[PDB]
Amino acid sequence: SLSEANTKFMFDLFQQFRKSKENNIFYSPISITSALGMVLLGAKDNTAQQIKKVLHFDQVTEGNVHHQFQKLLTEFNKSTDAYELKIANKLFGEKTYLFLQEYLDAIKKFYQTSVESVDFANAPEESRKKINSWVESQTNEKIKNLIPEGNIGSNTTLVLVNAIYFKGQWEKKFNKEDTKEEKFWPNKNTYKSIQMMRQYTSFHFASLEDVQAKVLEIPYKGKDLSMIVLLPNEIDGLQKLEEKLTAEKLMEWTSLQNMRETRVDLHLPRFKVEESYDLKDTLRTMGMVDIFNGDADLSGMTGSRGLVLSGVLHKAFVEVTEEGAEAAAATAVVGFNEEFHCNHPFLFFIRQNKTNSILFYGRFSSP
């Protein structure tokens, strides 16, 4: 399945980010998947095999990555009085550049992509600003400057973008009166102050005696989405939890079968994470290499070989407060009885419960 392939890709990414991200980590795997899916639709041969492999689409059973992405996107684009979820894809092309009508039709149909043309050739700065400004408009202005200066030139011919936006009330809101200053330990011998929200209510909970950690599910109102938190038992237990975590174990540890309704004294910080990623080298390292060099085959975009990707950028935001949470991200592809006290490092993610998809994943290491 496509959701399962997205989680695996998510954990592959995380193992890479652990090398260059010392503190907080936060991203939208689905955003990245959706962008690179749009690329896949116009890739051929080994350019296409590499992408498929890196994203785990070679494991998606009934071309059908795309069919499935269309379902997923329709399922995600739902807002309610209690939350909003939105995911939008767009192609910005050089106004003079021609794409195959079949590539354009395919991205419109499977990825709901809107197509705009811009003047990269003579106004690349202004084109860059238009794109950044569209992203802002899709993310309640939480993702600003997705594409910084110099990642677009007069020779840029395409920018494929995914934006994802979520804002949700908690099913059980925290009382702001109960929020208090506390110590947050990023390391055993070190602390930063933090605003700690506190609540005592029941939640799905499990003790993972094996990895010496706990899991909690914190639902949004309506329960169409939840934030899941994984908290090591020890201040410094995160690395081992990180070493042990795989797609299968996550699915195992976070299924309702393996959790139980439990009264939990939940202490969760008010927090915000903003992180930017240049993914070109990360993606090459994981196996996507033709796409970025002279062996690129993106002839399914234009009728013949010649397009190469110059860049892939990702930016993500999340803020957690007493009322709920707001999370956004965007991806640009450029072509030419129990306690649960979160006062030390933890992993968290926002899950779409119906599809069982992970929309956003992160590590909170330090305010």
Residue 346: its H or E element: strand 346-352
CB of 198 to Zn ion, least distance (A): 4
Task: Give residue 124's identity as a one-letter amino acid code.
Answer: P
Residue 41: its H or E element: none
Pairing verdict, β 324-335 and 309-320 = antiparallel
Task: Give residue 331's identity as a one-letter amino acid code.
Answer: T
Phi and psi for 136 in degrees, rounded to 5? -55, -45
- Cα 52 to its chain centre, rounded Å, is 18
> Is the sign of the CA dihedral 245, 265, 352, 323 positive or negative?
negative
- Rg for the chain (alpha carbons), in Å? 21
DSSP single-letter state for residue 209: T
Phi and psi for 170 in degrees, rounded to 5? -70, 150
Encoded tokens for 143: 């993702």
- 3-state DSSP helix/strand/coil percent for the chain, to nearest 5? 30, 40, 30
**269: closest CA among 340, 203, 201?**
340
What residues make contact with Zn ion under the rule CB under 5 A?
198, 261, 265
**301: closest CA among 44, 127, 118?**
44
> How far, in Å, CA of 322 to CA of 183, rounded?
18
